[model samples]
Target: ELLKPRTLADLIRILHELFAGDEVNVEEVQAVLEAYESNPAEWALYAKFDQYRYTRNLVDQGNGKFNLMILCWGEGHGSSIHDHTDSHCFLKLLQGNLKETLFDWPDKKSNEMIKKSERTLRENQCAYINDSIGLHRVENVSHTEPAVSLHLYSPPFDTSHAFDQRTGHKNKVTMTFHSKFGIRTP
Candidate 1:
């Protein structure tokens, strides 16, 4: 036997191949995740995902390609206003629901953040962000369930910035991953 193929693992491979195309777009990830959403066994892969606190689990940090991981969003947990700067980010709602709030500002030099729009994403829903999408905030809007999401960051972010929307302050922070799987090689 060559090897026993796993459904969930194979699905991840397909996603990688999809993103490896000429140019990555929101549609490609939408197709892969939509398939998993409709599959019970695929969802079963998350059965032991017991962490209830805020954490980022590294599933795969591709070799000079992308970073794929799962974000466990617990109540009273969320990311501060931030931008990928150069990374292309995509996500799919894996469990529960979340509130994605977008903000509009006059400029980075101003301490003015106008609440733009907020979108709610439930199981199977997807979202995309590049420069065009801009600054925003994300939180687990659910009180009864953890809002778990799978995120893919193309050309994995380095030197990313978090914003203090209220004070017009920017902080450069280094990213870290917990319970890593794939190695990040040069």
Candidate 2:
């Protein structure tokens, strides 16, 4: 079960079945994640030394409904506060620790963000957010080693908006993968 994407049949089958021909629920998605709680070192081949960004697409359940990715983060790296654009997001810490700081916009038209709170997630911890109403940022916060996390998004998005709260600037950017389908790697 703790194998590469192609051989991980159980994982693929479960994700596909859950999001097909049925309404979606967060708890049902959590069940699939529980199945992935085994040794993630089996996927360590994806770890990298970039500016803390290595997102590898593992599987796409088709139907444009959901996609799975494993992201590797090294020291001194993180992401801009971003929104998932109509998709729900689930993040699971796979290798190390991370700090997830979330923000909220008081008004839909306001280019402002309210600093809500922050939380730490160690290995095996998971974060589920309904992105339709979520805006957050993720960070490694480690000065020495690195961290890895799994991201699951429903109604997969290829391009999303990233916000600059201080300047109130927003832009549409393409979401590229560090590795794709366990084959392509940057």
Candidate 3:
């Protein structure tokens, strides 16, 4: 008689249904994310925070098609400008405020990175980007508050490249999770 309330589990399930082979419509994912409400209590186990750096906690691996994760950012914590390795990434801010700065791809010969644009995402706001959109660095700008964000990556990848703004040098880094399916890892 009434529509069922959406939850984290529902989000995962709906996403799985939306996927067609290795790809899913970016707009569809964005719509689902916008409709879903943010609930910190539901994700407490995987929202573990680190003092010195941000923590990447895996929520759902989505059977190798897409993976959902929660990134807990301590005050002043930020990430290096990085690429998504040809995957589509949708990030939704769950708590606090985050600043996202975009950069143009570096030149092949000189490797010079040009700053493109920047914006702050408030709670419940989501941003979508891929390598073609541009590289970006996300940071928790609040001096006294930590931040939490939900990330969904399609065709999940383990390695990505981080760029040096000044030198324009890039390095490949393997990503690891702080937790897996509500369990913390060492």
Local accuracy by lDDT, each model: 0.69, 0.71, 0.87
| Deviation in Å, model 1, residue 176 alpha carbon | 0.8
lDDT of 3 at 175: 96
Name the regions of candidate 2 deviating beyond 4 angstroms: 1-9, 48-56, 59-63, 106-112
lDDT of 2 by residue, 1-186 (tens): 233223334666667777776467787676566556636555655444466364555544356688877788877578878888788788878778988888774354656676789999878777887665578888888998688887888878778778887754678988887766566655
**TM-score top scorer:** 3
Q: How much does each candidate deviate from the true structure in C-alpha RMSD?
A: 5.2, 3.9, 2.3
User: What lDDT score is found at residue 32 in candidate 1?
Assistant: 64
Segments of candidate 1 deviating more than 4 angstroms: 1-6, 38-53, 182-186
Q: Is candidate 2 or candidate 3 better by lDDT?
A: 3
Clashing pairs in 3: none
**Which candidate would rank higher by TM-score, 1 or 2?**
2
Lowest summed-lDDT stretch of 10 residues in model 1? 43-52
User: For residues 80-186, could you state the per-residue lDDT of candidate 3 as single tens digits?
Assistant: 99999999999988889999999988876666677798999988887899999989999998999999999999879999999988877899999999999888898
Ranking by TM-score: 3, 2, 1
